[model samples]
Target chain A: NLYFQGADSCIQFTRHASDVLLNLNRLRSRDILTDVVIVVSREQFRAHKTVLMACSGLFYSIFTDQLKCNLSVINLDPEINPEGFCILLDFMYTSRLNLREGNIMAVMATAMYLQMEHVVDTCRKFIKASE
Target chain B: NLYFQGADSCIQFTRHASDVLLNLNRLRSRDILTDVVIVVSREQFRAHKTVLMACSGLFYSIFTDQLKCNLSVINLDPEINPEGFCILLDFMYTSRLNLREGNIMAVMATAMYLQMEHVVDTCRKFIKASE
Candidate 1:
């Protein structure tokens, strides 16, 4: 129900987009209607490509160009930490990324690899401060 | 890439939620992974339940109650105009509702029947201003 008025003649719900993202996360966790699987090592994330493409540059690039088709399975670099990708995938769904002392480097690599600029910037600040 | 600093340490994307919803509408239009079909007379909209429930009180109520489940099809009241519900569904995904002299009454009933208080209030104001 959160809102403000604008566009001269329309009603805008400020929280609407965020709520959709929230429930999208809810749907993803339950494996309700996921259409893609990202695999790294022994870990796999079942997700929706539309949501990922919307949040991520890497996904968008691949989705649009890659032979450009309805993708099924994506394999991550074996060297990449599944843990970092796991956290990043969650961030894509929820718009929140958590960086802790121990988890920061792996996450930074994954974020950079995925071309998630905002997340990379945040990781950099945390790195510089921690050093 | 839109963002600001806060949550103490977490990086947040301000436009991320909106972008997700935008592409969700994109996905729906393309009929890509829709989990529910909303049927109104001869018109049908294929959409994601999570997004609808998140944006609508009526959908949320039906989704969480009465067998409380993954609904595949929803039939509207026969009296409701398909045109208004069409517009309302778009609004649910985009957070913008267009009202015109010809379309307001039908849209208002659809908004109210759906228990979308913000949309209903906006319709009320438009009605009074038009009068």
Candidate 2:
């Protein structure tokens, strides 16, 4: 619950709030209603631009300031790791990041390139938490 | 973080997870990238079907088994309280529900009719909390 359950009957349904993202991830995975395609190193990823904009600062700015019309495909830098971008995409979609020591650099690179300060902050915290 | 922050850096960006829904509500408010419309009484509301499905059982079944393709609009029964449904809709999008003695029953009825057990449970708790 996000609201106070005090004398007044103000209530919250946080589970439902988070589940909203979970289901969007489900939709993205199945290519149900994806509106944008991102290409990295010739690898293609399908996603919802609204979801991206909400979670990524770059998308918010681009879709807000740059593109007045909806674009179907976005080509990211060729050097961004396709595999690592997939991890970040999964994190973006599912809110779950399976970051191993082996792949931390890859995600860090993608997040930095995307200007996702939140993702970068998480990566920073993970580093701070461990040896 | 939903996952473990073990020796290995399996990082989870939970702040971003919750933000996914936040921006979705923003999108819904702005009527951007919304794929579904729900009508309550004489009022109309725009929303994302994927977000609704993740949070509501009725929407899941309706979008899954009932409708083979995407639907642009869904008309809820007229008997449902449009005002209370708006409250619940706000709850669906923002994870916040403001209930009072004046509006609890209206929301309770809509939740029951929609088969939103979680919302109903919250209503029960709100009742249980106060005199």
- Give residue B110's lDDT in candidate 2 (0 to 100): 91
**Which pairs, if any, clash in model 2?**
none
Error of 1 at B78 (Å): 3.5
Model 2 chain A: ten consecutive residues of lowest lDDT: A1-10
lDDT of 2 by residue, B1-131 (tens): 43455354455554565677777888888887777889887899888777777777788778775453477889898999998888888888777788778899899899887777877887887778775
User: What C-alpha RMSD does candidate 1 show over the true interface residues after superposing them?
Assistant: 2.5
Q: How accurate is candidate 2 locally (lDDT)?
A: 0.76
True contacts recovered per prediction? 0.78, 0.88
- Maximum-lDDT candidate: 1
Off by over 4 Å in 1: A29-31, A34-37, A58-75, A121-131, B7-9, B29-37, B57-74, B115-117, B121-131
How much does each candidate deviate at the interface, measured as C-alpha RMSD after superposition? 2.5, 2.4
Best by TM-score: 2
DockQ values for all predictions?
A: 0.53, 0.60
- Tens-place lDDT per residue, model 1, B17-65, is 8877887787677776577888888888887776777678888777766
